[model samples]
Every structure is written in C-alpha cells, then in structure tokens.
Target: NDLVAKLWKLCDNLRDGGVSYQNYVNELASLLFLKMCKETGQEAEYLPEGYRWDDLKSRIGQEQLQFYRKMLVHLGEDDKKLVQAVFHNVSTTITEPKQITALVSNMDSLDWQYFTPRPLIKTIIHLLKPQPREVVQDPAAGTAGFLIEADRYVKSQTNDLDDLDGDTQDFQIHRAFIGLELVPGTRRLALMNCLLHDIEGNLDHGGAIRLGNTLGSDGENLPKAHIVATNPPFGSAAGTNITRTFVHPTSNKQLCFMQHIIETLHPGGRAAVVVPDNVLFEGGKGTDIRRDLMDKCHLHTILRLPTGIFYAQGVKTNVLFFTKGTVANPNQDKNCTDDVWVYDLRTNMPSFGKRTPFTDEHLQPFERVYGEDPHGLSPRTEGEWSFNAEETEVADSEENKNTDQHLATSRWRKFSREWIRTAKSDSLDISWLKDKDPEPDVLAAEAMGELVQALSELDALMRELGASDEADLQRQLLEEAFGGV
Candidate 1:
C-alpha cells in the first residue's frame, strides 16, 4: 500500500511538468518493462543480449540517459519479433538520468498483485474459465489483462503447463491466444506484459497483442475462438471510416463490439464483456442489436457492476455473459439466450478505488448465486440479492400491488426470452430490485407529449403579437388593389 501510494506522486511531478499523465505511465513502462524482464527471468529468453536490463542498469550519467534513448530506438527497430512489437513507436519524456533510475527502482518494489484488479478482469476470466487449446481473444484489449489472467487460469489447471503434452505446450506458447489493442503505447505495455506472463500469442502476424481498430476489418479477420473476453473502451465511434456492414450498424462502440463478438466466437463459444448501461436500454438500433445477440447467443447473465470500479466513476456498467449457441447444441444459432439471470451487484454499491481495495469478499455473494454452470443453465432460485435492502411500492395503485412483485428486492432474478421480447421489447435493462424506472419508449412518449402541449400554447400566444401586423398588411393590400394607400 505504501509503495503504490509513493508511485502516485510520480504522476503529480510530471503533471506539474505540463505533460499528459498518460506520458508518465508510458514512460514508466518503457524502462519498467526492462527490469520486469530481469526480475521474472524472462530476460535471458526474450530480451536481446547487449541491450538487456543489465546493460542499462550498469550505466550512469548523461551517457546512460543517451544510451537509454537509443535503446528504445534500437528495440523499436529490432529484428526480434517480440522485442520490436513492444518497442515499436515507443517514447520517453524523462530527460534526466535520475528520473529513469528513480522510477526503475520504485517499479521493482511494487508487488505484482498491487495493481487494481483491472476492475474484475480476473473475475471475468474466472467466470468463463478459459481452457487450454481454446483460442482466446480480447478485441480492444487494453494492456491484455483479460488475456494474461486467462492464461494464468489455464496454467494453474495444467500445472503451469507442465502437465500438457509437448505438442499442446507448443501450441499454447504460440497460437492459443490473440488480442487487439488500439493504442500504440498501450499495446507496447500489453506486449511486454504478455511476454512477462509467457503469453506469446500469435497476435499481429508475430505479436501477442496487435495495434489495430477492431471496428474495422481487423475484427473480422479474427479466428473463431472459444473465448472472446474484452472490456471495450468507453469511447465513441465518431470519425473513423468503418467499412464492415454489421446487421445493425451505429456509432455505439459497445454495440459494434457486441456484433463483432457474436460472429467471432466458435460454435458454443463463451464470452464475458464489460458494457456500459446505455447498451442495455438504448432503443432504436441498440435494441435491434440486443435482439440479434439474444437470438444468436445464450445471453444468460448480466452482472451489474458499480461505477468507478473501472474508475472513470462516470458510467454504470455491467458484464454480459453468454455462449454463442444453445448449451445442448453449439451449432444451433438462433434463439440462444432464452432465460437471462441478473445479479444486481450495482444497485447502491459504493464506488471503490485504490484508497480502499475491492477484494474478493465483495464478489463472493454474486459467485455463490452465479451457480456452477458457466452457461448459467444451472437451476436458480430468486432470492438473496441483498445490499442496502430497500423496499419498493408501485405508484399508489391497486394493480401495482398484485401484478407481480415477487422478483422485486432480489438482486438475482431470471427473465425469460418471451418476456424480454414482448414485455421488455428486448431491453436487457432488467432491474426490479428497486421501484422500476420507466421504459425508454414510455419516457420518450412522455417527453414528446409534453413538448407538443407546450407548442400549442406558444401558437396561441403568437397571435397576440401578430394581430396588428396582420391587420396593417391587409389594409395595405386592399389600398394597393384600389390604386392608393
């Protein structure tokens, strides 16, 4: 805790330097990648000899800083595929030698598990339980957290890959996992992180995590993997010239990635995606996309995550867990998600941060109710979704009391496909934990009706101002017609 706290100040000093805070993280990773290689024994196998961590660690003064600058260039242009993949287009703003050394010294002390758990990156990987030999992908894979944790899961099961056959081990090292990360520096970090974890996935021809946009042809070209785990960036699709003709195309980034995942998975393949709340209730094209996803995949579970867990503290998000086809038949595509089970981990939960770590204890409740089936087909009962445990009542009406309040107040509940389609209009924004919010279309209709009533009043008031002008114009027209005014 104390060491990680110390690193946060590095950002402030650089923030005082009038640069982007991202620059500090990127710069730290540039040198930190070298030392992490040495600490993990990956240096001898992965990093080049002369330019290895020892070479940089032994140097000092202006010359060492100069050497550090050139090492970045050399690695960026190096012939070694993995080395170049990480260093390609890398840069550093640390003009002084002490800044680099200070960060490197601090970096080594920071324990591996100290970082934010990528806001349930391990949890998602745990839920899916990616197996050996299955192709795993994380499109929009920032830092490849999902991929790395997934590899760890498989490794633990296979006794650190020691139990696998030699042929299977070879495949695991090379072709088992692939990911696409859009930003160059972020991809650099991802490539280095994967190398440290022994994930040399066949990413972009020879890389583990490629630098490319999944919204374009890059996503289409992915192999049909049994797992597609990703946290799609909370960004907009405004300017890029996208060419893929999805069944329901829109500027919604989550929706676009949703379409990509549905097609990218192998038969009966599974996925766990972190999505914003808008994707759940968005009408129009967003609803069509949801309908398409449910029809094609078993959209079995929605885990409502709290805000700031991903740390913008800005938008409410959830995990949409599903399999590509029915549990009985991987080949069967349509009508896949028949019953959606929701666990409201989000309702009234506190926003967690580095100040107070969000440990596994918080999630144990959800996992207990999450049941044994990864497909969420395990029998479930509507009970024990407790947090604040607030009570809800319908709008002072009679039918509200008798209609069906059984599902209310419980964080975990199941909704059938028929209910989703006809009653909910395919909106997976299913929350009865509290007095339910109004449906999107009803809200829209209310807004429209209010605007229309106001418009009529405005027209009636407009006549008060226009009457004299109208009379003057008529008199002038009559005079003009009679020959004088």
Candidate 2:
C-alpha cells in the first residue's frame, strides 16, 4: 500500500517550512499511526476537526520521498499517540542540513536481521511453550526476546487458537511474556511490536508488554516474577524522584536492575542477565549484591562479551546466567559463580557497528566454544568459556578484586608488587613469563682490539694533522660529521 501522497508534501514542509527534523518526525509519527489503522482495519483515532495533516505533508521530492519511506518502516497507526508524545518532548529547532542528513541516514542504515531472534527462540519455545510459565521483566529484555520468540514458536506449532480450548489460550497469554517500560513512548512501541507479533489480546489479560517504572514511583520494592532475561541499562547514577516509587536507589542503574530482576523472579526460576564485569567483584554493596545473589540465587554462567557489542560505547560487559533457586545458608562455603566458561570472542574480533552486520558469523566462535543443545537443554563446553572452579571463587571475593584502573595492559600481567617499582624505571620493560627472583649475573671481558686500533689511528691522525688530546680529536670528528668545526 502506498503512503497517502499527502505525507510526502508534509516532509517538504518540514524541511523548508521552518520545522525542525525532530518536529517533522513527531508529526509524521502521528500521521503514520493513522495510516496504519486504516490499513489494519482497526478504529482510527479522530484527529481534531479542520486539522488536515496534509497541510505539511504535501511537499514532495524524490530524495524526500525516499527519506520518508525509510522512516515509515515498522511504524504503524497504533503508535500515533506515543509518537506524538515523543516528538512533543523533542526540539523543533537547530535545523542544519548536516544534522538532518545524518538523522535520515541512521534510520535508513539500521540492520533488520538482528532485530529478531531465530533458532534459539524455536528451541526455547519447544521446551517451555506447552509448559507455560508466568513471566515478568523490566526494560532491556533479551529474555523478552526469548519469550516473544517462544510465543511465536508455540503459535506456529498449534493448528489454530480456535482449535484450542479457552483455558489453553489464556495459558498461552499468561505464560507467554510480560515487561515494564518506564518510557511511555518505548512502552507503546513495544506493545505494538508484540501485538504485531500476535501476543496481545489473545487471552483475558494478554502478557504482551506494559508501560511504567518497574520500581515504585515512591521508592519502594514491587512484585516479583517467575523468569527474567534482560540486558539491564549500564553506567552509574539511577534517577531518583522522591515522588516516584523505586525498588532500590543506588549509583549504579545496572545494579538496581539486577536487584529488581532478582527480586522479581519466583523462587527457583531462572534469570540470565548481561551486566558489567565489575558486578562480579565490586566492593561494599557490590560485594553485598553478589553475596546476596549467591545466597538467594544460584549463579551459574558468565559469558564475557567483547568491546563494540553495544552502540552505547566500547565498554566491557558480561552475561550472568543464574537460577533463583532456594536460598542457601550464608554459612555454606561456596562461591556464587562456579566455573564461568569464558568464550573469548573479543580477541581480534571485527565490528561493523551495533545494528549493522549483526551477523551470526560474529557469534559462531563463541558458540563453538560453548554450544547449546538444539533442544536448548545441553550447553556447549570447552574453548575459552571454561574456568577453573577454585580460581573463579577466589576472583569473586571482595579482597582479591582491584579497581578497573589497577589493570595493567592486557598483554602484561604483574605477579608481584615489586613489578610496579621496576615499571617506572623502564615503561617498556616486559616479562616473557611471570617469574620470581632474578637470575645470577654473568660478567664477560670487553674486547679491546677495536678500541686499541681506533685509538692508534686517532693518535696517528691527530699527530699528522697536528691536533692533540681527546678534545681536539672530538672537535674534528664533529666537523666531519656535521660540516662544522
């Protein structure tokens, strides 16, 4: 179906009619939503009377048409309200040709391949689809990705929803997937995305997705969940609104998300989270979080990711896979994470941006090291993912950990404190292998033939030239070398 020709004219109005690109996007979002409703046979929202969207949409050019078409992908009429709100908050000024071009370019450039999970989703659905576990999660769901994948999996396997009994449909909805997103705009988009995928309205209360801060608006803990899979937000300093309910208020957003996910899971449910490496060995509450997690949840796997995986930046991240099993006695002498199979794919890996070229070839090496069963039951082992149980335990303890700054170059590892003192003497000094103590010194005689011959020749030359002493000879040498006396 063609976009109403009116929207193209609006694109020109936005470009030449003093509208900022952001503003144009907001207006288009609303228009696209209306168009989507018309296409899907859904009821369309009534735009205020006398407000023809064509007022700005009629301006058209090949370049502008192409740009608008790219922006129109994945957008639908159901998203109009949310899209309008997003643009309302954005700026309508600072219009520059360069800035506008980049915006259009980025939209056109996103790779659609990595947008969906494939084979893994099929496996997870096969295993848990019929079982139907109730699930809930926060923003940044890799697990929601899994759940959605599972939902589609089950849907395809079944003959038809009409064929299933009423209870079965409800079970699929309830057990399928659920999430909390504070950003209303993203929440709306997620809801629509899931709906398009056919998870919403399939049951009494379809668990497609929800919009809200998972933490309390007033700073308090909320309800828990049965399963969790998320790549929580990273960096320090979570927002704190006294009027807003929050589960945990800490400098680290990822930590708070981890805490939230852990709390949300039902006892004995499993959670797989992607987190910063520091979470494994931070001090104070970092220690507390790990300690508590160990006591409450069974930490099982850690998949260390390479740099350039996230568009956010080149920061290092790790995926911690754990089960919310029965809480253990704190007194039990056990490490929280045991034998983390580190698949070192980060070494010498090529990157072509986050959204572009999200190729499976990039992940193949890691999978080879740690392959999972086609049934999603047996995980592959060997290669870099393997870890010595004792070393991993010692490393996770608070005492053994060091700040990120303390790390030497990835190539050189120091075995002792004395190495730092020697480091300053020669910054380039490196050890072939970590060794203790220096080897015995050996002295060799210096050869004097070259020295003697040079001296003899120098003496003869000096006398012949009527020059004397080291000073005079050096002066002549300088003159020969530099053409100066």
Count of residue pairs whose backbone atoms collide, per candidate: 1, 22
Q: What overall lDDT goes with each candidate model?
A: 0.70, 0.43
| lDDT by residue (tens digit), candidate 1, 1-485 | 34334445555544543435446555655665676566554566767766776556534335456777788888999578787998899866766554554444344444431123453877778878888899888887788888888889899899999999988997888888888866778789989998998878774464778777788777788777889888886645323334566776554567888989998898889998888887898654566788899888888889988656655666778889999988698988688777788888866665577776677777878877887777777777877645553443323332123335554556777778887787676788877543334543454345435434443443343334455577688868888787833
lDDT of 2 by residue, 44-79 (tens): 243321122221121122333433443333232335
Give me the overall lDDT of model 2.
Answer: 0.43
Q: Candidate 2: where is the Cα deviation over 4 Å?
A: 1-131, 139-147, 156-165, 201-207, 217-223, 236-249, 326-338, 354-356, 364-381, 384-485
**If scored against the real structure, what TM-score would every candidate get?**
0.63, 0.46
Candidate 2 least-lDDT 10 residues: 438-447
